[PDB]
Design a protein around this ligand. Structure first.
Ligand SMILES: C[C@]12CCC(=O)C=C1CC[C@@H]1[C@@H]2[C@@H](O)C[C@@]2(C)[C@H]1CC[C@]2(O)C(=O)CO
Lengths: 338, 34
């Protein structure tokens, strides 16, 4: 299948490079699929230039696809990801929290439920602390407690918040033995390091590629199921080069070049990292601008040009350990009257 | 003589689904204790 695949991966790496640009030495963790899905959901309500900019910014080719085909593709992906599974836990949900008095088109609420699985929950944003707790509780529930305070500030004049979450919990195909985890150096720079629990595996046959073009080593560690982790280890002082060359083409070349190798020893830290982002700057850099201004056209939501985006926020957490990985994220689109 | 792969400096991690070709999560670890 993989209809959304090319746009979603182009968007992923465009987003990654912009996130790094803001703080080039910080940890990064985000779900591009959560952000793409939240913005596709937003585009369900958008018209005219507001709509064109969102779909173009999500890296779709608007001369060869329709908005209807895009929404149907997200609907199908959501159904695939949420199907019952015993191998791994994977869940994605969408919701809208809306001021009760705001008139919504029946077409919009019906399409949001049918395509994105989104209910519409009456929310009193004038009681801002209560509205924030409710939205954060929805996200906490969807992420099994891992994304706790997605919404920090919430304007009492907010009219609607669109929310996406993703939850991922998987076991390694080849789990690490905690008896082989030992505190070891992690070099923050060539001459500075800290101590971290370093997991290890011995005589491990996995997909491997030494990339001499980008001075990095790539390995694939599978989960149980159809999911895997691709790990890329740049040589010292080659991280910036690898980052600059990230792209759909580079990812495809890596995948095409992996070959099985019996690794003598693999060392991987046990770690947990978290990041939260205000995505306004990056979305504007990607050309999504009218949705934020007083020219916003979200008239597919209400039937009138009476709404505009105020903020898009994202939070994500990644936890890597001997038995597997837990990762979760959520995206919220805050919308005011116009 | 066998290759050693030692993730003891900054690295990238991409969580992918081979079936849907989705990137679920993208990460750079510059400090596991940051
Ligand atoms: C770029 C690619 C192909 C072109 C496209 O529209 C989307 C993607 C992103 C996901 C990639 C995929 C393929 O290359 C196969 C990949 C790498 C997959 C992630 C893991 C993968 O399935 C493999 O590693 C198979 O070897």
């Amino acid at each position: 299948d993989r209809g959304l695949a090319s746009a979603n991966v182009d968007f992923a790496f465009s987003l990654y490079k912009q996130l790094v640009l803001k703080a080039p030495d910080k940890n990064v963790i985000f779900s591009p699929l959560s952000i793409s899905t939240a913005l596709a959901f937003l585009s369900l309500g958008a018209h005219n230039t507001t709509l064109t900019e969102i779909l173009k910014g999500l890296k779709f080719n608007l001369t060869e696809t329709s908005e209807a085909e895009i929404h149907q593709s997200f609907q199908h992906l959501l159904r695939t990801l949420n199907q019952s599974s015993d191998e791994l836990q994977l869940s994605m949900g969408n919701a809208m929290f809306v001021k009760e008095q705001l008139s919504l088109l029946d077409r919009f609420t019906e399409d949001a439920k049918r395509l994105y699985g989104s209910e519409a929950f009456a929310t009193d944003f004038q009681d801002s602390a209560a509205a924030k707790k409710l939205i954060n509780d929805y996200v906490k529930n969807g992420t099994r407690g891992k994304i706790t305070d997605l919404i920090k500030d919430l304007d009492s004049q907010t009219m609607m918040v669109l929310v996406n979450y993703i939850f991922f919990k998987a076991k390694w195909e080849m789990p690490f033995d905690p008896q082989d985890t030992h505190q070891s150096r992690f070099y923050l720079s060539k001459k500075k390091w800290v101590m971290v629990p370093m997991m290890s595996l011995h005589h491990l046959t996995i997909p491997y590629f030494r990339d001499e073009e980008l001075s990095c080593t790539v390995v694939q560690l599978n989960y149980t199921g159809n999911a895997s982790a691709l790990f890329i280890l740049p040589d010292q002082d080659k991280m910036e080069e690898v980052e600059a060359m990230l792209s759909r083409e580079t990812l495809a070349r890596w995948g095409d070049s992996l070959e099985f190798r019996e690794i003598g020893e693999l060392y991987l830290p046990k770690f947990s990292i978290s990041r939260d982002y205000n995505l306004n700057d990056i979305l504007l850099q990607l050309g999504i601008e009218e949705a934020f201004t007083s020219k916003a056209d979200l008239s597919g939501i209400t039937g009138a040009r009476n709404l505009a985006v105020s903020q898009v926020v994202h939070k994500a957490v990644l936890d890597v350990f001997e038995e597997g990985t837990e990762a979760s994220a959520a995206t919220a689109v805050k919308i005011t009257l116009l | 003589t066998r290759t050693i792969v030692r993730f003891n400096r900054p690295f990238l991690m991409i969580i992918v689904d081979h079936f849907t070709w989705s990137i679920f999560f993208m990460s750079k670890v510059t400090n596991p204790k940051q």
